[PDB]
């Protein structure tokens, strides 16, 4: 039964992935929280730790991204602001810094310029 422990691990991974896919789909209706301009490129197809498989975005340096929310320390949710690009998982600045530390050894400017912004806020009831 050294492989029933691995089915337990898989079931845990699957539940986590299902919840991530829900939060991703539900982000589509949230407002844009803020924009960033990128100072680095990133290829989500080559990333392996993505909360949902095949949903990491890609972008070039000097692109603009729209961020809907932060998922965890390594991932945000949003989209490349270009026609046809859809919402997905976005590597956090920390993740990009750690990729850069690896790309460095084996083969300082922050990876995103965050654009702070005012937003129109309509007050609702205290619920």
């Amino acid at each position: 039964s050294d492989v029933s422990l691995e089915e337990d691990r898989e079931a845990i991974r699957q539940e986590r992935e299902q919840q991530a896919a829900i939060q991703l789909e539900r982000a589509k209706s949230k407002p844009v929280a803020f924009a960033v301009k990128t100072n680095v490129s990133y290829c989500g197809a080559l990333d392996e730790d993505v909360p949902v498989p095949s949903t990491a975005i890609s972008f070039d340096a000097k692109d603009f991204l729209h961020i809907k929310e932060k998922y965890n320390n390594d991932w945000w949710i949003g989209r490349l602001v270009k026609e046809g690009c859809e919402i997905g998982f976005i590597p956090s600045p920390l993740r990009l810094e750690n990729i850069r530390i690896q790309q460095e050894q084996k083969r300082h400017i922050p990876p995103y310029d965050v654009v702070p912004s005012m937003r129109p806020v309509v007050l609702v009831g205290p619920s």
Partner: protein, 69 residues
Amino acid sequence: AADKPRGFARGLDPERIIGATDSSGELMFLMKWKDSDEADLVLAKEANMKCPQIVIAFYEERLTWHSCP
């Protein structure tokens, strides 16, 4: 204090506003222009007049409802 044309003086078409700030005392927009990755600041009052639907699309994108804050 620069001399290159800035903002709407660059003669480019507006694409999208990417932020709004009144830190200077007057409301300004950070404007992305079509076919340029170089965004710069324009006065909101001017953009309200020149490209009101661009202004509105930004506000609709960022519009948020909050409870007693």
